[PDB]
Write a protein that binds this DNA or RNA. Structure first.
Lengths: 104, 227, 52, 65, 70, 141, 98
RNA sequence: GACAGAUUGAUAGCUCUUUCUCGAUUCCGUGGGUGGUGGUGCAUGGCCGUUCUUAGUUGGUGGAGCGAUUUGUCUGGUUAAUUCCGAUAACGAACGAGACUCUGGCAUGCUAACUAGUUACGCGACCCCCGAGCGGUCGGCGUCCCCCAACUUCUUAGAGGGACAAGUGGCGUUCAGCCACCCGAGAUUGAGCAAUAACAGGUCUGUGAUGCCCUUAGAUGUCCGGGGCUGCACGCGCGCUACACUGACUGGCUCAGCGUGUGCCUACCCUACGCCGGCAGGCGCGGGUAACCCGUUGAACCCCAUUCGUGAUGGGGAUCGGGGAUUGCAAUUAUUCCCCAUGAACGAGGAAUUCCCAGUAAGUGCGGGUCAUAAGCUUGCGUUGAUUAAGUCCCUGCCCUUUGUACACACCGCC
């Protein structure tokens, strides 16, 4: 075995991240062990501000190009089964999943 | 390798890789009606579902073309031997995708045809397919030294709001001809408002559906019952 | 094969648009290196969606 | 000034009442989520905004038809 | 600097209000809440306000970079 | 009556006095010809900053558990006319905040902490706020 | 049948070894992933391949400054007869499928 | 494809002898390209600008006109808004507005969170009189933390709720609504999205989008070196800093937010803490795919502590003298910075004219963008935070209606 696993869920789509995030809670609590539920980091807003205009002219209008990236993370304690079950299931959309070994 | 590229600078990169594909893919599987990839990253592997139409051409000689494109994507964005499998699939109801039809109109003109009869042939189709509405614009010089702009329209179309963003299927494609350059713009309206399966939101937020009294029979004298 | 030599290492000598090799109004930030137009083309595809 | 009602509301409102006179009353927050039951109002603003006339037409009805 | 003060004013009037309410009484809570809200200065009321954003084509929210004009 | 309980600006007034009336600290030579920070226009009038600034610096460390030279420079700031230019923020002089720290170190008001940065040592912790009692109890006013 | 012999004879036999040869449009690389025994960047590669297409023994795409060099069935002859290579040859697209 | 010199700028065999190798490349014609930040934005695509965040636009069926057309699409009240109701030859519909999205604020209501905070504990402590206190006890920063406290009071971000002219009193055709007040965020916190239809608006120099045209080796192909784009009797355009004492410089205290950061597509950061130096800086060393490190982001105004005395003075702070650092292979054409040194006009601006109503103008730094070097540029962000309109069409310009019109390149017309 039982080691200090962190699962770091980073994705853009809040809804398609929190269907996965819920399935790891409900996937672990099925075969119960521990957790400390989903952590909510500040959402990072990737904000670009370019001119609307190609070339010069016209009254100066710009767009406000944004991309969000919310990070959840979920602590757990398990063997090399429950990790390799819970991570490989509940994948699919534009969702990145990290797996820390223990502590550091 | 031990870079760990940033959740800021990484999703940007995979957005970019996404874009870089969807262009060469568009620009090479054009005559075959590329609708779109949906990039499918996995363990040990990077699936990449090429959602196009006429799959007899993406395969080619016994499945050569698919194997070229796999090799290409191996040699470009850095995907080792057996770490990338393309997966060509046919588009469901190709009338309702925009760039499919917009390309079908780059090549219907390119082939040699009037604007008029062609774009109707498109516009006819996309409605008949099953659209809430649609429009096509063929800007550019059109049998005259001067530039015209032509716009043949049919059915319903919302032209503002967030709603637009997940409902219309916009698609611009040029067309390079023996003269010069026209623009296609296909802009279809999706009637997944009726039945996506669960059509996203479904309501255009304006639209409310009041389910009707259904029963509400009987005032009557009192009575009782037992069970 | 010799001579074609300077700092092509800093200065806009070095950096150019990844899409079209034009060398102005360049979105350096965030490891893009697109020209500012080549945003609005390759933008939705990237992920930057116009919200407010 | 800010708020006069739109015909998506004025029409839906009037049509709920035509069909559920008995279900509604002269409160807001009751008939407020009656509308959640008997209709598919997507947005909370509208859902909520609709119980607007649902009341303003009961206050009319008791006084007159 | 200044904000931090109606912040701490509001806090030791609110806190003191929740004091006499939760365990102590209510009459004194109400005699307090009266004594305060007969002149607020947003004592128990959060000032609902917060700053506007800047919009392009102006130094602040509203004002605009001077119009050239022939 | 800690450093906080004493009205903090008439703290360093008396703490400047302390380190003067001790007659030891280690006043040096860049002193009479010091700018104080490229920041400033002009060399300071009370000819005796660092008795009053080592006062500040040392009480400052009391309030904050750890502080580097880079920190001390930061804190004694200001605006800076580059002239017709707009004003910007320039760090204070390192040399002086440093030698203030090193000099406080001589009397052993302070020490180098673990994990980098100076903090004040128990001995100094005293001399500092001993006089806090003396500043409150100088008189109520 | 041209240019730096050592480099260009190797570029042919690279292209015959492979199904597809990608590149980049950049004269200033002194290298190119796989092969590049020595230098042979874009130029020596391009100069070769932009020959091959125009005569007809290769076909292009471009796609965000790169050159998408795809080997033509006629070229199979041109380059194997250039390289005296066996009359079976098997370039690269041997392609065990299913 | 050519290691010493004539040269040339160049160790450019680019060329004037010598020749020593790769060795089927080479060279010379012809056609033809291939580019070109060449040409043409009245040859075009896209994208943008705008008429124009202005209320407008359209059709099915009716009804009117032989028919272009017309009503529906409107006297009036209303409304931010042909938005609504109603009068109603129209009835019921569609796009724009609205609804929506993002956002911004009430949520001791929920789900939680060592990549937040933590909170307050429990306070178990170190703990020095840090301070109070004879001592018990207490006020308090720091830490000793950790944690198998406990929790979400603020932090964060998920689900939620709510606010909806909702109640009451006026006013109102007593409809549509408007006004006041109650509870409370009172119906409006701010953008994005934005129709029909336009316009030689702009863009070929954002586009491997490109029509045609030019040009095409002596090349307008690509560059090296330099130069220019910076030049200066004058003219205008957006900025900043001042004109000072509600202020100037001299102590000190002390309050963030949005970001941003390395290790990035080809050679490159963010920076904590040691010494050295005045300072630029320098030289030591440390954390940092980051809510951890920078970083309780320790700011300016601001706030507080002394000078000064209304002197073009200490404001101001230009123009030059001289040093010293840094970036850069190189700064001459002061690169950027520091250190000295000189030390200007301006004492509130002549004719005009833009900006806007609430957390608004203004000041005020600070990020971002631009960046090797670097901003007086913008775009965001708080922070300090006013005066005043809350209405009208008086000027300018916009909407409808009626009307006149010899205008329809539409009055910048026609004559």
């Amino acid at each position: 075995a039982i080691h200090r696993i962190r699962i770091t869920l980073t994705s853009r789509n809040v809804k398609s991240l929190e269907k996965v995030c819920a399935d790891l809670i409900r996937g672990a609590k099925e075969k119960n062990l521990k957790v400390k539920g989903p952590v909510r980091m500040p959402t990072k807003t990737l904000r670009i501000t370019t001119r609307k205009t190609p070339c010069g002219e016209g009254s100066k209008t710009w767009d406000r190009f944004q991309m969000r990236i919310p990070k959840r993370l979920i602590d757990l304690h398990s063997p090399s089964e429950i990790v390799k079950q819970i991570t490989s299931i509940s994948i699919e959309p534009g969702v990145e999943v990290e797996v820390t070994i223990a502590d550091a | 390798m031990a870079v760990q590229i940033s959740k800021k600078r990484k999703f940007v990169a995979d957005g970019i890789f996404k874009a870089e594909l969807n262009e060469f893919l568009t620009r090479e599987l054009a005559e075959d009606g590329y609708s779109g990839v949906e990039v499918r990253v996995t363990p040990t592997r990077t699936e990449i579902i090429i959602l196009a139409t006429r799959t007899q051409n993406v395969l080619g000689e016994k499945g050569r073309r698919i194997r070229e494109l796999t090799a290409v994507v191996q040699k470009r964005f850095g995907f080792p031997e057996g770490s990338v499998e393309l997966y060509a699939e046919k588009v469901a109801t190709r009338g309702l995708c925009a760039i499919a039809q917009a390309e079908s109109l780059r090549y219907k003109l390119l082939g040699g045809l009037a604007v008029r009869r062609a774009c109707y042939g498109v516009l006819r189709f996309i409605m008949e397919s099953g659209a809430k509405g649609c429009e096509v614009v063929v800007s550019g010089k059109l049998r005259g030294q001067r530039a015209k702009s032509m716009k043949f329209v049919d059915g319903l179309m919302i032209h503002s709001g967030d709603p637009v963003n997940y409902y219309v299927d916009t698609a611009v494609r040029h067309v390079l001809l023996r003269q010069g350059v026209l623009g296609i713009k296909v802009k279809i309206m999706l009637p997944w408002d009726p039945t996506g399966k669960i059509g996203p939101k479904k309501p255009l937020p304006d639209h409310v559906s009041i389910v009707e009294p259904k029963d509400e029979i009987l005032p009557t004298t009192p009575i009782s019952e037992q069970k | 094969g010799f001579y074609w030599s300077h700092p092509r290492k800093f200065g806009q000598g070095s950096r150019s648009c990844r899409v079209c090799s034009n060398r102005h109004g360049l979105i350096r930030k965030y490891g893009l290196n697109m020209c500012r137009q080549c945003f609005r083309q390759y933008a939705k595809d990237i992920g930057f969606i116009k919200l407010d | 000034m800010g708020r006069v009602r739109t015909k998506t509301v004025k029409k839906a409102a009037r049509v709920i009442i035509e069909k559920y006179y008995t279900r509604l009353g002269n409160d807001f927050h009751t008939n407020k989520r009656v509308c959640e039951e008997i209709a598919i109002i997507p947005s909370k603003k509208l859902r909520n905004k609709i119980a607007g006339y649902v009341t303003h037409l009961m206050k009319r009805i008791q006084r007159g038809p | 600097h200044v904000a931090q003060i109606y912040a701490i004013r509001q806090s030791i009037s609110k806190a003191l209000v929740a004091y006499y309410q939760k365990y102590v009484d209510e009459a004194s809570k109400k005699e307090i809440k009266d004594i305060l809200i007969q002149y607020d200065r947003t004592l128990l009321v959060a000032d609902p306000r917060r700053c506007e954003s800047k919009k392009f084509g102006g130094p602040g929210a509203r004002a605009r970079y001077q119009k050239s004009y022939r | 009556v800690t450093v906080k309980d004493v009205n903090q600006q008439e703290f360093v007034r008396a703490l400047a006095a302390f380190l003067k009336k001790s007659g030891k600290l280690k006043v040096p030579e860049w002193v009479d010809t010091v700018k104080l920070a490229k920041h400033k226009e002009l060399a300071p009038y009370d000819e005796n900053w660092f008795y009053t600034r080592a006062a500040s610096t040392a009480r400052h460390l009391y309030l904050r558990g750890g502080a580097g030279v880079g920190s001390m420079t930061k804190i004694y700031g200001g605006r800076q006319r580059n002239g017709v230019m707009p004003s910007h923020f320039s760090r204070g002089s390192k040399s002086v905040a440093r030698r203030v720290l090193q000099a406080l170190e001589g009397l052993k008001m302070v020490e180098k902490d673990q994990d980098g940065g100076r903090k004040l040592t128990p001995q100094g912790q005293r001399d500092l706020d001993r006089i806090a009692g003396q500043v409150a109890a100088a008189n109520k006013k | 049948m041209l240019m730096p012999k050592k480099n260009r004879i190797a570029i042919y036999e690279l292209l015959f070894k492979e199904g597809v040869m990608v590149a980049k449009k950049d004269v200033h690389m002194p290298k190119h992933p796989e092969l590049a025994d020595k230098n042979v960047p874009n130029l020596h590669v391009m100069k070769a391949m932009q020959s091959l297409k125009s005569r007809g023994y290769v076909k292009e795409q471009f796609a965000w400054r790169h050159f998408y060099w795809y080997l033509t069935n006629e070229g199979i002859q041109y380059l194997r007869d250039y390289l005296h290579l066996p009359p079976e040859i098997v370039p690269a697209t041997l392609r065990r499928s299913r």
